[PDB]
Amino acid sequence: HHWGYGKHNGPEHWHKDFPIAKGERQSPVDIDTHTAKYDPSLKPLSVSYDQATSLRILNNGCAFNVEFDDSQDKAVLKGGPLDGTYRLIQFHFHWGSLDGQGSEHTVDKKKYAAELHLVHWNTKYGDFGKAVQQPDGLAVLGIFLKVGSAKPGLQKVVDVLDSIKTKGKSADFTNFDPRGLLPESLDYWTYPGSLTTPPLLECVTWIVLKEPISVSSEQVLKFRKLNFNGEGEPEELMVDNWRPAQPLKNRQIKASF
């Protein structure tokens, strides 16, 4: 794909091919914690990952995706602002070149080192590609990463990155438990938005956890050794693969706490 994160094809350029980039419900956004309102109508969030079946990890030239078997309700998200059942299809991260940037969402304008997106699709639409055409097709669980203590549950991801350095490379990645990437609290903010990469479809209910997870400098450093390019091409470190905050326009962010 043409688009990217370079100064010639980055986020400021996307609108030329994807005019929805200047749409009414684009993501990410800044979460103003003093404007977000507690919503007692929200039901408890249910993260049901015990039967998760990971398959593979893929460098797709933009991030790396850990892919799951979504042929059955094996790892689902329910509750919270959601109606129905949303199946985990993949997770990926966005991260920076420096520890002071990398997240897509911001919290009172604070940028985190990275942001994990666990992507789920609404089973009432039958498959992911149909779901992304619907305003309630996806539910993305967003989790901030800050640099501190190592995250043990991330280390298996870190250790395979050497095997998917360049675009198009994949590796088997079975028996990975995504529960190890969750913080202790499931307190979140929620709002209607979009994919944060082209095609930027406005199909996401965003659920952004308040509590970050901590990862070590060594761990995030390993993310930064990935490459955007394909093998045998000049090296372009995979860093700063984040879209900045977009206008909130006619939306309200709700808090679960």
Which residues of the shown chain bind Zn ion in the complex (CB under 5 A)? 117
Number of other residues whose CB lies within 10 A of the CB of residue 85: 18
- Minimal distance in Å, beta carbon 100 to Zn ion? 19
Q: How far apart are CA 213 and CA 145, in angstroms?
A: 5
C-alpha closest to that of 147 among 224, 49, 209: 224
Number of other residues whose CB lies within 10 A of the CB of residue 98: 13
- Minimal distance in Å, beta carbon 92 to Zn ion? 5
- Minimal distance in Å, beta carbon 241 to Zn ion? 9
Query: For Zn ion, which is the closer residue by CB, 117 or 169?
Result: 117
- Minimal distance in Å, beta carbon 115 to Zn ion? 7
Query: For Zn ion, which is the closer residue by CB, 36 or 119?
Result: 119
Q: How far apart are CA 155 and CA 153, in angstroms?
A: 6
DSSP-assigned letter for residue 218: H
Q: How far apart are CA 107 and CA 34, in angstroms?
A: 10
Q: How far apart are CA 80 and CA 99, in angstroms?
A: 31
C-alpha closest to that of 87 among 41, 43, 125: 125
- Residue 144 tokens, joined: 């901030």
Query: For Zn ion, which is the closer residue by CB, 117 or 222?
Result: 117
Q: Which residue is nearest to Zn ion (CB)?
A: 117
- Minimal distance in Å, beta carbon 47 to Zn ion? 18
Query: For Zn ion, which is the closer residue by CB, 85 or 194?
Result: 194
Query: For Zn ion, which is the closer residue by CB, 27 or 256?
Result: 27
- Minimal distance in Å, beta carbon 78 to Zn ion? 21
Query: For Zn ion, which is the closer residue by CB, 117 or 120?
Result: 117
DSSP letter for each residue of 132-147: TTSTTSEEEEEEEEEE
- Minimal distance in Å, beta carbon 102 to Zn ion? 12
Query: For Zn ion, which is the closer residue by CB, 47 or 119?
Result: 119
Q: In DSSP terms, which residues pair with 118 in a beta bridge? A: 91, 141
- For 223, residues 6+ apart whose C-beta sits below 8 A from its C-beta are 93, 95, 114, 158, 161, 238
Which phi and psi (to 5°) does residue 127 adopt? -150, 165
